[PDB]
Enzyme design. Structure first.
Site, PDB file in Angstrom:
ATOM      1  N   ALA A 187      29.079  -9.983 -49.827  1.00 33.45           N
ATOM      2  CA  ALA A 187      29.301  -8.912 -48.844  1.00 33.45           C
ATOM      3  C   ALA A 187      27.668  -8.574 -48.022  1.00 33.45           C
ATOM      4  CB  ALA A 187      29.600  -7.624 -49.434  1.00 33.45           C
TER       5      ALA A 187
ATOM      6  N   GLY B 108      30.844  -5.894 -56.634  1.00 34.94           N
ATOM      7  CA  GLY B 108      30.646  -6.970 -57.297  1.00 34.94           C
ATOM      8  C   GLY B 108      29.218  -6.456 -58.233  1.00 34.94           C
TER       9      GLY B 108
ATOM     10  N   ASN C 182      35.538   0.418 -45.940  1.00 40.12           N
ATOM     11  CA  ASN C 182      36.363  -0.801 -45.410  1.00 40.12           C
ATOM     12  C   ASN C 182      37.501  -0.201 -44.778  1.00 40.12           C
ATOM     13  OD1 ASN C 182      34.135  -2.664 -45.573  1.00 40.12           O
ATOM     14  ND2 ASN C 182      35.179  -3.753 -47.422  1.00 40.12           N
TER      15      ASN C 182
ATOM     16  N   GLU D  79      10.716   9.580 -39.325  1.00 39.95           N
ATOM     17  CA  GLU D  79      11.226  10.763 -38.609  1.00 39.95           C
ATOM     18  C   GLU D  79      12.798  11.229 -38.602  1.00 39.95           C
ATOM     19  OE1 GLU D  79       9.813  10.239 -34.661  1.00 39.95           O
ATOM     20  OE2 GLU D  79      10.981  12.058 -33.730  1.00 39.95           O
TER      21      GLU D  79
HETATM   22  N1  LIG Z   1      32.320  -4.609 -45.609  1.00 42.08           N
HETATM   23  C1  LIG Z   1      32.617  -5.660 -46.358  1.00 42.08           C
HETATM   24  N2  LIG Z   1      33.016  -5.675 -47.434  1.00 42.08           N
HETATM   25  C2  LIG Z   1      33.071  -6.752 -48.364  1.00 42.08           C
HETATM   26  C3  LIG Z   1      32.738  -8.021 -47.569  1.00 42.08           C
HETATM   27  N3  LIG Z   1      32.878  -8.960 -48.569  1.00 42.08           N
HETATM   28  C4  LIG Z   1      33.387  -8.434 -49.645  1.00 42.08           C
HETATM   29  N4  LIG Z   1      33.213  -7.070 -49.426  1.00 42.08           N
HETATM   30  C5  LIG Z   1      33.621  -6.233 -50.419  1.00 42.08           C
HETATM   31  O1  LIG Z   1      32.496  -6.130 -51.653  1.00 42.08           O
HETATM   32  C6  LIG Z   1      33.117  -6.174 -52.917  1.00 42.08           C
HETATM   33  C7  LIG Z   1      32.558  -7.261 -53.767  1.00 42.08           C
HETATM   34  O2  LIG Z   1      30.989  -7.174 -53.308  1.00 42.08           O
HETATM   35  P1  LIG Z   1      29.974  -8.425 -53.731  1.00 42.08           P
HETATM   36  O3  LIG Z   1      28.816  -7.856 -54.499  1.00 42.08           O
HETATM   37  O4  LIG Z   1      29.764  -9.131 -52.441  1.00 42.08           O
HETATM   38  O5  LIG Z   1      30.987  -9.565 -54.701  1.00 42.08           O
HETATM   39  P2  LIG Z   1      30.347 -10.835 -54.791  1.00 42.08           P
HETATM   40  O6  LIG Z   1      29.393 -11.358 -53.544  1.00 42.08           O
HETATM   41  O7  LIG Z   1      31.250 -11.820 -55.154  1.00 42.08           O
HETATM   42  O8  LIG Z   1      29.371 -10.765 -56.082  1.00 42.08           O
HETATM   43  P3  LIG Z   1      29.960 -10.724 -57.702  1.00 42.08           P
HETATM   44  O9  LIG Z   1      31.396 -10.055 -57.315  1.00 42.08           O
HETATM   45  O10 LIG Z   1      29.399  -9.745 -58.404  1.00 42.08           O
HETATM   46  O11 LIG Z   1      29.968 -11.967 -57.977  1.00 42.08           O
HETATM   47  C8  LIG Z   1      34.595  -6.512 -52.510  1.00 42.08           C
HETATM   48  O12 LIG Z   1      35.573  -6.001 -53.451  1.00 42.08           O
HETATM   49  C9  LIG Z   1      34.766  -6.228 -51.020  1.00 42.08           C
HETATM   50  O13 LIG Z   1      35.581  -4.834 -51.078  1.00 42.08           O
HETATM   51  C10 LIG Z   1      32.523  -8.128 -46.173  1.00 42.08           C
HETATM   52  O14 LIG Z   1      32.485  -9.074 -45.667  1.00 42.08           O
HETATM   53  N5  LIG Z   1      32.319  -6.926 -45.299  1.00 42.08           N
END
Ligand SMILES: Nc1nc2c(ncn2[C@@H]2O[C@H](COP(=O)(O)OP(=O)(O)OP(=O)(O)O)[C@@H](O)[C@H]2O)c(=O)[nH]1
Ligand SMILES: CC(=O)O[C@H]1C(=O)[C@@]2(C)[C@H]([C@H](OC(=O)c3ccccc3)[C@]3(O)C[C@H](OC(=O)[C@H](O)[C@@H](NC(=O)c4ccccc4)c4ccccc4)C(C)=C1C3(C)C)[C@]1(OC(C)=O)CO[C@@H]1C[C@@H]2O
Ligand SMILES: CC(=O)O[C@H]1C(=O)[C@@]2(C)[C@H]([C@H](OC(=O)c3ccccc3)[C@]3(O)C[C@H](OC(=O)[C@H](O)[C@@H](NC(=O)c4ccccc4)c4ccccc4)C(C)=C1C3(C)C)[C@]1(OC(C)=O)CO[C@@H]1C[C@@H]2O
Ligand SMILES: Nc1ncnc2c1ncn2[C@@H]1O[C@H](COP(=O)(O)OP(=O)(O)NP(=O)(O)O)[C@@H](O)[C@H]1O
Ligand SMILES: Nc1nc2c(ncn2[C@@H]2O[C@H](COP(=O)(O)OP(=O)(O)O)[C@@H](O)[C@H]2O)c(=O)[nH]1
Ligand SMILES: Nc1nc2c(ncn2[C@@H]2O[C@H](COP(=O)(O)OP(=O)(O)O)[C@@H](O)[C@H]2O)c(=O)[nH]1
Ligand SMILES: [Mg+2]
Ligand SMILES: [Mg+2]
Lengths: 346, 427, 426, 426
Positions: B11, B131, B194, B242
């Site tokens: 993300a 994640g 989201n 600020e």
């Molecule tokens: N706003 C937004 N949210 C996202 C996006 N991609 C994933 N997410 C959210 O992020 C969550 C997981 O976050 P991440 O830390 O990126 O997951 P990851 O990159 O696979 O890392 P791990 O799951 O720990 O392996 C998901 O459940 C989504 O809801 C994105 O492109 N934009």
């Protein structure tokens, strides 16, 4: 029926006395009454106004069934809590003794200590043996000893590691009989030989070679006394039953991640914490379901919980023992294990 | 006046993609870094200016998309930090076993950037709560970064575990564990839902089928208005510190909501006639909140309004006076005022291949409120429930995460909730 | 990273053969092992399942285990005799003959090392081993015997890696052996303790699906295995290319197992329609979820609606709106709030990959952790009991050195499994 | 919005088949489901009756229910076998054989779920479900049995939606069964209670119309069904394109039912003329109303002039003056003030749509809520009574578990219906 939670500390030594600039975090203010110090009057911030802190500013009150401290001798702490557990064994049902803490917090020392003092195992045999020789003229004594270590979720023959772990299977009866497969069983001929086997066991226990506790047992162990006494008289009811006493030991658990936690240290550390979780699950399920009507307890989470399937859960009694540190170096560990004990209590 | 951006998991990276696309568009910077700004791009003698950014993912996948896709030539290869095994939605693994294996490299790369950077203002972290590679790793990194740069501003742009819908079932855990780190070490955090965005896409952009691409572009556009906007030299160049001066009244309460009120479709761009008051009014309507929260059930602690393009201070002041006249929305009784204004001269950024139609002016709102605190209660219930059953607990215990840590995390979250309650009530 | 695929027994071998057909096609690999695909992403994670041998010959990271020469011969004589590596063909003395003890305890035990040596060779060719996938039956004898035998051995070597298996479960009305309960019970006894995730597939359920939805006149094993292979791919397909939401065996386990032991899953697959009915398909996310959450499309015999959902994984394939998916997930949980376990806030874990199955515009796969599955265990346990009460066929295992205690212990431990699923159902 | 069309029994299926011919032609849809119409308004509300499947294949939002395989086969073998979706063909065990109890109570009851599942699938493909249309006979057994069976079930699912049905009524002189009164009586008993609007069509009346006005030498069922389909379209045609005055099933009900229970309607259709007489037509609104209010052009056997009009709907098609229409409505009510029920101020509800039936310059359809219809109920009740007094044929329903009490209760309740219509007639 209901379990008893009891608690005691190691001490503070010249390592803590040298540290003049420190505030203690443990303060037993009365029997069964532990206050978690010290709040927050720190010079490392502000806090000179009406507190808006969650707990950093107040004190945490922990209340147990039998809280002790460094003042109380283990000669009394043990017997105060387990003398009835030993008698409970002979009341038609079994019993068991627990322990708890982080690595270096006095397990191994509190079960025995320096080879001139009393402890869990020593006093167990001291008291029992006196009862045996006093009551030897009334009942026949056929008592046996079961030895066991848990390491990497594996059951080891504590006294004879020469036998493969595949030869150790933990089962229980509908009569609550302890059904363990091929194991080097022995008999309590005298406390000297008993303790010699305990030492032999402690030698055989697979340890850490990392932290300052480098003797650091790093494995669980259970010593079970199986008492099969019989009658010397003939009558219509002459059917003497049997029962056991489980002595429960734990590996010890460090902070979630240590500075050198690699490889097997991660692996066994996980296995330890999983085992501790399994106990937490069963204990909490047991107590809460004693409050309720139905008792589904997750005895399959660990081989230890299988081992304690009836020792912890049946129509029986036990005492929880927790080792406490007064140092702020164990602030999180001690505090969290205190909460654990309190949750186990309720 | 320079800053460093940080991207974690998938993300954080995907959001970053949108951000750095925008910055390129703003400065005319090509996909290989060539310019035909120094606060985002390190000056290169060849003209190929390179992003001041750190990318982290314990499973290179999304980074490989960057490495093989467009802007692989933009970013420096040293910045694209990857692992081998992912944290897999486990805060504890991201915090410890897995994350700690690269955190040394990460800090070293940051140090290099910080050594290159003269007037470092602070950092901008893009992460989630879902994640572990985002949540857990960020927790680790922020602690380490806080130690090294106690005097630098740390912004955290987080994707808030949405109350209505989510994608992982162990989010509550990762979210609540993050909270006590962010609240501790961050200087200012943002929480974005989201689902609130998808709703905005439906209502304002008229999009029946919205995805992360467009969603991220909106988020990035907000960040541009928060940060890059200042670096274009406007009438009122409100510093990042600020912002903190005026937005934050206490040692805590680091949770402003960031809205964008020129959200508009290409069709509407023809019929709609926007201006300062119209757009400003829109940003106080419980619809473009960018989070599942309804301001009308709380109070406003502080509100910074950032303007871009064709605006004048007179109209801005008038719009604010109208808002205070409206009196529908409530303000903290012991906060005489709460309005602060930033003004650019540079227009809003337009994304070729986007939707957000070109406008002559734009407004961003950075608002602190007591209403948002209610969102954490929803998370508390989700956590409490799963926690009560200890569902999935063995995945954190398997790492070694102390059970008591979960109870502590909750208490810290609850403290935060309590603080907001006191703010609204007391006078 | 890399994943090891081990096949055990005729059943497992036939399924695996179809599996490797599918994913080799997916990754543009012909019957020589040469790559002639049209995408670049097919080579992005080809290492997951293939060694890259000199000449760019891609070699299944797989071990072929059997005790009945002849089945192994049919593999070598098939289209993938030019694909699989010869030293991965492990077989010797004749098969168990539906004798679990022969497969696990004795005859099969003798040949364990010949497998494990190959396991090590495979491991050391990897850059990062993630885990193992075992494909086998749960009653065959050899597949079920060698299955749990090797699972134990492998975990001892790789205790920290992921143990995944796809197990064909004894079906109420589809048999071929009268000791199916003995073999299953002895197997699952060791399966649970040494497995991180397991999938339960009934041939009966597939027999129903392959007619009810696919309207096949003559559903053959090659068609039932084909259904299985589709879901097998879906489980790990997220690891082999880009997607909006990534997924993993670990990620799934983290979001699919709430209680250590309850790691039995029902598998399903989206667009299930006959070739004459495909023209009436909408191919929308709504449509897909209607099928995915249709009890009749579950590849386990037990109908989910007699139990509850502890947790669900919904992995989607191809370009689609993330909001659209999320909306449907919400609609489903709102529709059947009585089916989903209330203890979980979001009962459905989702993932979305950018590439649909070649030839489909958009697909998905379904993994359900339902409490209903307990009923399959009950049924088998009852059959086991009825026989065991008479010590029926016991001498076949007695002669191998198996006692009664194992059988009573296994059943006791099987009861615990069911009890746990019932504990977490209202 | 969307409307579900369910066909039940051979009669209903044959009528429906003709209906879908008509409206598919109306909306420019060929025998593949492809759109090749010349207007844009044909696609403006195509969603009402068609799913838009991939490739722009428009699929009847309809469910085909029967218990006699063979009729269903003739549907698949007909021109719309390429139109209707295969999973909407619901049939199994052989038909009732004019046994209402088999259709409703027993054999048909066993297959209800196989219909309702399709109903749900259809419902969830909709953006807004307005209601249901059922096409069936009132004496057939299966069509009348499954008819009221499904009506009850559907209302339980969608109590707030509109239940519309087109029912073929037992005709004095046109038969084909001697238990026509038993089946009709048992059917209507449940029909009234669970229906929002119902249309009564007599084959005898159509037999008269198709000769008296259309001068057909050999009026076949395909021609009688054709007449029906014309009126079926008219009822909902207002929903599918623009008009000066809109109309709706709900709107009609609101203006057509003054007393909850009295929702039985007579249907009619404007320009009825033979192909040799069409050249003498004026094609004026006056002319149309002369036909619409002509008793001889009513598709119910009962002649309206023996009763009174509780309320009338006049739905017109094509470009016309609103004043011109209003004038004619006034002239009609002035002409026959004795026929119209004085309790209503304006006895006629009107609607005007901008598009005539393709090929006509201007058309209309007539829906009458007359009190005269009571006489059809009387006639049937008398036939029922005569048989019932001897318990004639009763054992055919007794063997299905039907008692006498149902039959006496039904008749008692049928008498109430007639009595109510008589209550509101002078
Ligand atoms: N706003 C937004 N949210 C996202 C996006 N991609 C994933 N997410 C959210 O992020 C969550 C997981 O976050 P991440 O830390 O990126 O997951 P990851 O990159 O696979 O890392 P791990 O799951 O720990 O392996 C998901 O459940 C989504 O809801 C994105 O492109 N934009
Ligand atoms: C002209 C056209 O579009 O044909 C389709 C087709 O008609 C349908 C009916 C296919 C067809 O599948 C079957 O008939 C089938 C046969 C045995 C067991 C299971 C299914 C198809 O054979 C299957 C084939 O699937 C694929 O190509 C996927 O990539 C799939 N591949 C295989 O299973 C495969 C088959 C043979 C050799 C190698 C691989 C896949 C799915 C998941 C993960 C990886 C791969 C497709 C779309 C079709 C045909 C060709 C008719 C369907 O199945 C799949 C798995 O897609 C059955 O219902 C779906 C809907 C499809 O529209
Ligand atoms: C050269 C010419 O103008 O021919 C006319 C024609 O001669 C007449 C006699 C038609 C004709 O109708 C019949 O002969 C008829 C046959 C069986 C049952 C009922 C009627 C016609 O067949 C019917 C046809 O109707 C339509 O096209 C409408 O759109 C109608 N369509 C259908 O019924 C239809 C028929 C076959 C296939 C698909 C649809 C419709 C009416 C209401 C709602 C929707 C559609 C028309 C004007 C004619 C012919 C072709 C000769 C008439 O009927 C209709 C319904 O319009 C009969 O009296 C009218 C007056 C018409 O002038
Ligand atoms: N009450 C005590 N008084 C004096 N010394 C103590 C006491 N408790 C513990 N120690 C000392 O601290 C060192 C022991 O750690 P112990 O051996 O107490 O750690 P442990 O709990 O068994 N660690 P671990 O095995 O890793 O779980 C010993 O050498 C003891 O002498
Ligand atoms: N799904 C599936 N199952 C099969 C197939 N062939 C056999 N089986 C099942 O597997 C069992 C036999 O397993 P098998 O591989 O022969 O074990 P073995 O006989 O010990 O080698 C049978 O009872 C079948 O139910 C197949 O092609 N597909
Ligand atoms: N209007 C019309 N009525 C029909 C047709 N065919 C049969 N019927 C009537 O419907 C009755 C039989 O209904 P049917 O569909 O066969 O019911 P089933 O026999 O139980 O399946 C007969 O008594 C006829 O009066 C037709 O094509 N059109
Ligand atoms: Mg020790
Ligand atoms: Mg990740």
């Amino acid at each position: 029926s209901s379990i008893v939670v009891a608690i005691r500390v190691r001490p503070f030594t010249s390592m803590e006395k040298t540290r003049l600039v420190i505030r203690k975090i443990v303060d037993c203010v009365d029997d069964r009454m532990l206050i978690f110090d010290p709040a927050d009057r720190n010079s490392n911030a502000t806090n000179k106004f009406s507190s808006q802190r969650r707990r950093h500013g107040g004190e945490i009150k922990f209340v147990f069934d039998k809280l002790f401290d460094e003042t109380s001798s283990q000669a009394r702490v043990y017997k105060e809590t387990t003398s009835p557990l030993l008698d409970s064994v002979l009341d038609g049902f079994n019993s068991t003794v627990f322990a708890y803490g982080a690595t270096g917090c006095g397990k191994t020392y509190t079960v025995s200590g320096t080879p001139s003092q009393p402890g869990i195992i020593f006093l167990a045999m001291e008291e029992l043996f006196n009862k045996i020789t006093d009551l030897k003229d009334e009942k026949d004594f056929e008592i046996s000893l079961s030895y066991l270590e848990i390491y990497n979720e594996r059951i080891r023959d504590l006294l004879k590691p020469e036998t493969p772990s595949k030869r150790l299977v933990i089962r229980e009866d509908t009569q609550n009989h302890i059904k363990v497969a091929n194991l080097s069983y022995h008999h309590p001929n005298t406390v000297e030989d008993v303790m010699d086997l305990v030492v032999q066991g402690n030698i055989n226990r697979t340890t850490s070679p990392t932290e300052a506790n480098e003797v650091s047992s790093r494995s669980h162990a259970v010593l079970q006394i199986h008492i099969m006494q019989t009658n010397k008289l003939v009558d219509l009811t002459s059917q003497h039953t049997f029962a056991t006493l489980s002595i429960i030991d734990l590996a010890g658990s460090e902070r979630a991640a240590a500075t050198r936690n690699r490889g097997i240290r991660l692996h066994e550390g996980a296995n330890i914490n999983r085992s501790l979780l399994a106990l937490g699950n069963c204990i909490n399920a047991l107590c809460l379901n004693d409050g309720s009507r139905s008792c589904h307890i997750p005895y399959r989470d660990s081989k230890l919980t299988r081992l304690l399937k009836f020792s912890l859960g049946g129509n029986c009694k036990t005492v929880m023992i927790v080792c406490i540190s007064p140092s702020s170096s164990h602030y999180d560990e001690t505090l969290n294990t205190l909460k654990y004990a309190n949750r186990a209590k309720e | 006046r320079e800053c460093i951006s940080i991207h974690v998991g998938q993300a954080g990276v995907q959001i970053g993609n949108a951000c750095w696309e925008l910055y390129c568009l703003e400065h005319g910077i090509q996909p290989d870094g060539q310019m035909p700004f120094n606060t985002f791009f390190s000056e290169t003698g060849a003209g190929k200016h390179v992003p001041r950014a750190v990318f982290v993912d314990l499973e290179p996948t999304v980074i490989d998309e960057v490495r093989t896709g467009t802007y692989r030539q933009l970013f420096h290869p040293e910045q694209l930090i990857t692992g081998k095994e992912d944290a897999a939605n486990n805060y504890a693994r991201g915090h410890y076993t897995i994350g700690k294996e690269i955190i040394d490299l990460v800090l070293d790369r940051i140090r290099k950037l910080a050594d290159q950077c003269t007037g470092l203002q602070g950092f901008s972290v893009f992460h989630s709560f879902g994640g572990g590679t985002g949540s857990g790793f960020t927790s680790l990194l922020m602690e380490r970064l806080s130690v090294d740069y106690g005097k630098k501003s740390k912004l955290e742009f987080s994707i808030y575990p949405a109350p209505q819908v989510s994608t992982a079932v162990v989010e509550p855990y990762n979210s609540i564990l993050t909270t006590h780190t962010t609240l501790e070490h961050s200087d200012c955090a943002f929480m974005v839902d989201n689902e609130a965005i998808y709703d905005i896409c439906r209502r304002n952009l008229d999009i029946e089928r919205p995805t992360y691409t467009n969603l991220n572009r909106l988020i990035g556009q907000i960040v541009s208005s928060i940060t890059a906007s200042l670096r274009f030299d406007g009438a009122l160049n409100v510093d990042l510190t600020e912002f903190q001066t005026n937005l934050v009244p206490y040692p805590r309460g680091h949770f402003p909501l960031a809205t964008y009120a020129p959200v508009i479709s290409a069709e509407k761009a023809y019929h709609e006639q926007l201006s300062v008051a119209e757009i400003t009014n829109a940003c106080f309507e419980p619809a473009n909140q960018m989070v599942k929260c309804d301001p009308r059930h709380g109070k406003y602690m502080a509100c910074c309004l950032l303007y871009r393009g064709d605006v004048v201070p007179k109209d801005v002041n008038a719009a604010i006076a109208t808002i205070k006249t409206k009196r529908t929305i409530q303000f903290v009784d012991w906060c005489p005022t709460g309005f602060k204004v930033g003004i650019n001269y540079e227009p809003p950024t337009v994304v070729p291949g986007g939707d957000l139609a070109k406008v002559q002016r734009a407004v961003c709102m950075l608002s602190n409120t007591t209403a948002i605190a209610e969102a954490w209660a929803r998370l508390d219930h989700k956590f409490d429930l799963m926690y009560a059953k200890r569902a999935f607990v063995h995945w954190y215990v398997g790492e070694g995460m102390e059970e008591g840590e979960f109870s502590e995390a909750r208490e810290d979250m609850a403290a935060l909730e309590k603080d907001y309650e006191e703010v609204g009530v007391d006078s | 990273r890399e994943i090891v695929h081990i096949q055990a027994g005729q059943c497992g071998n036939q399924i695996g053969a179809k599996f490797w057909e599918v994913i080799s096609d997916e990754h543009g690999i012909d019957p020589t092992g040469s790559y002639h695909g049209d995408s670049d992403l097919q080579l992005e994670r080809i290492n997951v399942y293939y060694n890259e041998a000199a000449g760019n010959k891609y070699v299944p990271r797989a071990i072929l285990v059997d005790l009945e020469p002849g089945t192994m011969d049919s593999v070598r004589s098939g289209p993938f005799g030019q694909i699989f590596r010869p030293d991965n063909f492990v077989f010797g003395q004749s098969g168990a003959g539906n004798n679990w003890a022969k497969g696990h305890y004795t005859e099969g035990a003798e040949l364990v090392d010949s497998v494990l040596d190959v396991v090590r060779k495979e491991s050391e060719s990897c850059d990062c081993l993630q885990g193992f996938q075992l494909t086998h039956s749960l009653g065959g004898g050899t597949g079920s015997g060698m299955g749990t035998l090797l699972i134990s051995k492998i975990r001892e070597e790789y205790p920290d890696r992921i143990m995944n298996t796809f197990s064909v479960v004894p079906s109420p009305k589809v048999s071929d052996t009268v000791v199916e309960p003995y073999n299953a019970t002895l197997s699952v006894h060791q399966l649970v303790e040494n497995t991180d995730e397991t999938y339960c597939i009934d041939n009966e359920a597939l027999y129903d699906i392959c007619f009810r939805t696919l309207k096949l006149t003559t559903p053959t094993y090659g068609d039932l295995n084909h259904l299985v292979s589709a879901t097998m791919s879906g489980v790990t397909t997220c690891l082999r290319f880009p997607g909006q939401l990534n997924a993993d065996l670990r990620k799934l386990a983290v979001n699919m197992v709430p209680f250590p032991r309850l790691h039995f899953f029902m598998p399903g697959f989206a667009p299930l329609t006959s070739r004459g009915s495909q023209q009436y398909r909408a191919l929308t996310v709504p449509e897909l979820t209607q099928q995915m959450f249709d009890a009749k499309n579950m590849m386990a015999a037990c109908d989910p609606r007699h139990g509850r959902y502890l947790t669900v994984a919904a992995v989607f394939r191809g370009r689609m709106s993330m909001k659209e998916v999320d909306e449907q997930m919400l609609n489903v949980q709102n529709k059947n709030s009585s089916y989903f376990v209330e203890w979980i806030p979001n009962n459905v874990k989702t993932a979305v990959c950018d590439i649909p199955p070649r030839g489909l515009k958009m697909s998905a796969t379904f993994i359900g952790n339902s409490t209903a599955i307990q009923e399959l265990f009950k049924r088998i346990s009852e059959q086991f009991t009825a026989m065991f009460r008479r010590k029926a066929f016991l001498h076949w295992y007695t002669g191998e050195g198996m006692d009664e205690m194992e059988f009573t212990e296994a059943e006791s431990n099987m009861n615990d499994l069911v009890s746990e699923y019932q504990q977490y159902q209202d």
